[PDB]
Design a protein around this ligand. Structure first.
Ligand SMILES: [Zn+2]
Ligand SMILES: [Zn+2]
Ligand SMILES: [Zn+2]
Ligand SMILES: [Zn+2]
Lengths: 72, 70
DNA sequence: CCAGAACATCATGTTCTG
DNA sequence: CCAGAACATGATGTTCTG
């Protein structure tokens, strides 16, 4: 098996340049195309795992960027 | 005038406390649903009009600290 | 005016299609 | 295999109903 570089769930494949799970793949594509602006309610360092990833879009988006996801 | 939980514009006195509509229904569903809420932070999230949706654990906790019940 | 239900929209995740 | 669209669903918020 292989892990999502963003949320540590089971990766489904290489998406947007990075190993990710399906949910993170479509989250990113949705985050980079739409207007959302996200606000972190903690300290910009929220725990993004399978359980908590939808708590903080802001921190999930940032982790997406830091892993190097991009549309091409 | 301001929701004690999220500082959004309150609507009336709900469950003991001046809160907004969204907080009223969140609180009732919280208590009467008993979901496993988990904070992604340190159990001290900021809860305002936007951030209240981020962390229902902290939101439900702040409701309690405000005095909401029944 | 307020509680509870009903409705409407959000946000997310799986599945399908190209 | 991967991207983009379509579908499915549970959480949130507003409106109606008692
Ligand atoms: Zn992921
Ligand atoms: Zn965060
Ligand atoms: Zn509120
Ligand atoms: Zn929290």
């Amino acid at each position: 098996p292989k892990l999502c570089l963003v949320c540590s769930d089971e990766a489904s494949g290489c998406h947007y340049g990075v190993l990710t799970c399906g949910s993170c793949k479509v989250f990113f594509k949705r985050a980079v195309e739409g207007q959302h602006n996200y606000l972190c309610a903690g300290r910009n360092d929220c725990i993004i795992d399978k359980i908590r990833r939808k708590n903080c879009p802001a921190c999930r988006y940032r982790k997406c960027l830091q892993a190097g996801m991009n549309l091409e």
